[PDB]
Amino acid sequence: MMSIAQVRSAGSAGNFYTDVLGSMGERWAGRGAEQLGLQGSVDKDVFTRLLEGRLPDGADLSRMQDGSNRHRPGYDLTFSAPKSVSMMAMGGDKIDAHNQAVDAVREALASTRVMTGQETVLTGNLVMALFNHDTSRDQEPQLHTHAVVANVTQNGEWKTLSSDKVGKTGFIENVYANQIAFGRLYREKLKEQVEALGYETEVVGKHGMWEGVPVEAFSGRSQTIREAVGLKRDVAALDTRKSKQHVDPEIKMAEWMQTLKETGFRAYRDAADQADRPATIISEPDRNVRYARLAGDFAASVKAGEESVAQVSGVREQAILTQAIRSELKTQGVLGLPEVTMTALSPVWLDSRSRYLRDMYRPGMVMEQWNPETRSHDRYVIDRVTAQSHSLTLRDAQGETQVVRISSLDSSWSLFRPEKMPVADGERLRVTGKIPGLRVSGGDRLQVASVSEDAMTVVVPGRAEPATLPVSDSPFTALKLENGWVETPGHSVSDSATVFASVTQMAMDNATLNGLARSGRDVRLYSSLDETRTAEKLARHPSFT
Amino acid sequence: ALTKAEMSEYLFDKLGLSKRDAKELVELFFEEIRRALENGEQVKLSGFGNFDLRDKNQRPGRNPKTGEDIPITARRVVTFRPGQKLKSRVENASP
Amino acid sequence: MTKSELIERLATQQSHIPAKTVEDAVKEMLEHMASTLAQGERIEIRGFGSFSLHYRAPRTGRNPKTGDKVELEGKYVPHFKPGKELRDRANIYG
Amino acid sequence: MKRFGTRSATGKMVKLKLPVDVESLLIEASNRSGRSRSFEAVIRLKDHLHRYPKFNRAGGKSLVKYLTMRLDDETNQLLIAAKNRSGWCKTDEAADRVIDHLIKFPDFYN
Amino acid sequence: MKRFGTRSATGKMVKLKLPVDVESLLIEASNRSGRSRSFEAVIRLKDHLHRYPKFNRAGNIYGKSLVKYLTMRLDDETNQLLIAAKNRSGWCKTDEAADRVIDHLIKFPDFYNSEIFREA
Amino acid sequence: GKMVKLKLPVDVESLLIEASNRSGRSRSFEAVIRLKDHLHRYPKFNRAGNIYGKSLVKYLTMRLDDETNQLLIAAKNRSGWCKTDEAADRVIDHLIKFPDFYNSEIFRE
DNA sequence: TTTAAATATCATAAAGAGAGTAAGAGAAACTAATTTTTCATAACACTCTATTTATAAAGAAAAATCAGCAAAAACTTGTTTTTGCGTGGGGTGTGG
DNA sequence: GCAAAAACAAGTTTTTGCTGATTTTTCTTTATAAATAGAGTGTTATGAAAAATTAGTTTCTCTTACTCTCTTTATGATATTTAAA
Ligand SMILES: [Mg+2]
């Protein structure tokens, strides 16, 4: 059996895979492995260096994105067999029946992509480190080896192993498709050696799988998975996988021999070897009266306990509606009288065509760079934008300044725009980024009960206990938050929320109407168009009352 | 009279430096001379002149209006000796 | 310090402006001052001082290396009067 | 030059400022070519931006008539690069290039 | 009037904007050729794109005159040539097609698949 | 009888396809136009002979108008032959005499 | 008894318009960033003078910066050129 | 299926050392110029705040390029009918 999984991070696997004498020890192989001069034994530091991108040669395959190395380390090519072989190798059957069997890695699909607007090239070799494991995750006997194939392959130029989501012509696509074929490729060699060793072989079921009585007893993981689940099976396997626990090899042998007390055969080698969505519309022409009525209806909905969401398009219109909503809630008493003030950071979107353009950088805004060493963002405030050197001057919380050329900015930098906002009893807030100290994430709808000009009472969703946040008057310590009473059309999806929306005479477009219905079960739409003339736009899937 | 604002505008027009850049640069240009005179160095601006520093002994000064003698305290002063080139451009600089 | 050292200090403090641009700014400021003096005009910078031209009437003269007397033409000469802040900062006595 | 050079001008629409005595030139060109005023201005701006990247100039001084120019993505990037390279605001750079193209090439049918 | 050609053009159907002064002339040429109106327009345009890859424009001859729209459905090669000319000239696809059709009507009033050109 | 058909042997079918497709005209309209052209040019049409009849005959349809139908009716007095002859034989003669024919002013090319 | 026609009648396929969509025109309004005006307000100027301290005069050397240039180093522009998702999958259920 | 990060060639701007050019610094004795305390009076540079204003973006009404769909003759084949040898 070969189970194939994607390695996630170099730092994880480098320590994980490097960490009864074991099986035999660690190893490595590959037709391209010997080119770098590394064979057999492989050190921990070099293994993690190869996983992150540091080749034994001078090449470097690191790919920095979002402040982190997004390069995929490689693919884990595992090799495993039923409990029969592990029970054999427990006698201590020489182990090599599996090690040489895997040492089928003697790679036909190995290829790299080399453009010239158009192509793959048959490199045909790679560097694969093989780590030998003795038991399963239940510590029950299961001899298997993880052959970690790093995403590093040598046309005389190094490149990552081929991948292509469209076309599926690359190495990884073929390996994933040929999973069962490669499993059956491995399947044969153990029996081929056993034909000289004379032990029993027999097909057991699906896909020609072949596999001594205690074999059923040593399959606790398979039995538990079947009990829990009755392929995407994978969820149960991930959920029920306990972490590795240390066991003394002779104590483990004692436990195995005691638990297998009754059903068995040894005395097998003694003889066998002798081998030789509704909607409703209201019409109000003027913005002031329409917003006042909409906000009053929203406040009435909030008072009775009905879940409601405000909805307008456009930033300025959103601000106006938010002001009206807050005023009407204050009249209704849902929002508390003693308002306070605080600062917050709202994200500014950037991309490749824009982050090298000076026009969107302004003094008074915040820049954060993810420090890979401190594992936190260093916060700066832009003090100067200079055209003569195309350079921003950034000031830290300590007050020192540094000059950075715009051509040297990249995805590691995040640009935020400071803002100010009032807060009172019952205010609704949206988290816009990785808020420190909380598992809350972007878009989450926090609620605040009370404030004391120095700290806030906030209800984290699902925490069921009052968490507290600081009040800050500086960009360097402001929270990545926003007010969440009025949202953007189609921003959030809800199957039951009522959307108290307002639409102008020109926002009736298809996308706005589709997102509006998507935002909730029902919409109490307020329209700028005349009564029953706004209903002309209802020639769509959403229905009237 | 010539003004820091006038020199700032002149730098803006002839070099393109931003208004903040020109203002800060002229203010720093004056402040650096003030600091270099504060710490006792001589400033030799070739083509314009020298800012020598002179140490003065006490003198028997007086109040000219009342005639009462009031001693001049010993002090250190800045003296500007124009160079040869600047004087040539100024010899006929009639207002 | 000389002019080059002054330019170096200004460039070091003003990191964003290139050194060549700072040198050009210093030379242009000096030329502006020299031209304003040549135009018979007064320079006044609060906290630094004032530049002005004073008339010298035609007078007698002598060549001290030989002693021969030579009368000269009347001409203007530059003069400098330090400001309050510069006087306080440059002096080291009470 | 840098009358309003520090401002942000990433938008796709330019409220072109024209002297009242070249608005007549633009209207005449529009009538002769059939193009809308914005079309004529934008296409002449593209032509000038491609032909002359360096546009050193001495810098009107009368009443001004404002017109709406709706650039496309390619013209907007070139114009922003040019305004950053010259220090002028987007309106002034666009007006200078449009006026130069109008005076030098009176028809521009290509 | 004539707008900027911002939108990308890849569809095969085009609404030919012909001045009412020249719609009748195209109908006359069509009954001269024995070909259908729309097919006459297509067969004119596909060869006009061949004869004059570079095409100087007329100076808004009709302008304020009324216009009528004719349904056109082009083939792949004609569509490709038209889009190439549209990108090389900066007008919209409708205006480029209309102007080239008018030019081919004026120059060759009895065009016959590039082998015979004109009689009137 | 507005509908009448043309006896076209196998050999002339390829020539008709070539001439009509290069002309950019449909088969029916091309047939009617060619028939009217041959009727126009030779009002004194005489026996030409049915030489091609040594091949399998195929029919191409057409729909006449009043003018051409009456012209064929009157031309059938000139021959005493069948109406399929009156329609087809002159069409074959025109197809072998004037391919590449836009109008009367443009000659055989 | 065929057969050479005579005249319908469905099948559908280049045509040919009506409607919907979404984006361009053009004059208009809003918004905040840059520019010019207004306005304190303290620094500057001038006078009163008895007397102590500097510095032009010139002119030919020592010498002390400098600037223009030639060469390299940082740097931006435009264009290729490599990568990564995410996958599929037999069991013995592994690979944070 | 496409960005986005990385390599690479191409100028382009900014910095850096060299060496003659160019400007500075020295010395001789003698006259005026300048240096200056306090105080009063009137000017004037100059930074803060405010008002103007203008670049930039968003709005409102209309129009029409571009596409989809509904209708229509047009081309054509299948089909029934018919007069003569
Ligand atoms: Mg393992």
Residue numbers in the entry:
A (entry chain H): 1 to 19, 25 to 95, 97 to 100, 103 to 111, 113 to 115, 118 to 127, 129 to 130, 132 to 167, ...
B (entry chain C): 2 to 96
C (entry chain D): 1 to 94
D (entry chain E): 1 to 59, 63 to 113
E (entry chain F): 1 to 120
F (entry chain G): 11 to 119
Quote the paper.
These additional densities may correspond to the AH and CTD domains of TraI or/and to TraM, a protein that is also part of the complex. Near atomic resolution was not achieved for the AH and CTD domains, nonetheless we were able to locate these domains within the relaxosome. Apparently, this region makes no specific and stabilising contacts with proteins or DNA nearby.
The nucleoprotein complex termed relaxosome contains the relaxase and other auxiliary transfer proteins, which assembles at the “origin of transfer” (oriT) region of a plasmid and prepares it for transfer to another bacterial cell. The F plasmid relaxosome complex contains, in addition to oriT, three plasmid-encoded proteins including the DNA-processing enzyme TraI (generally known as the “relaxase”) and 2 accessory proteins TraY and TraM, and IHF, a protein encoded by the bacterial genome. TraI is a multi-domain protein that consists of an N-terminal trans-esterase (TE) domain that contains its “relaxase” activity, followed by two helicase domains (one vestigial (VH), the other active (AH)), and a C-terminal domain (CTD) responsible for interactions with TraM. Here, we describe the cryo-EM structure of the fully assembled relaxosome encoded by the paradigm F plasmid in two different states corresponding to distinct functional steps along the DNA processing reaction.
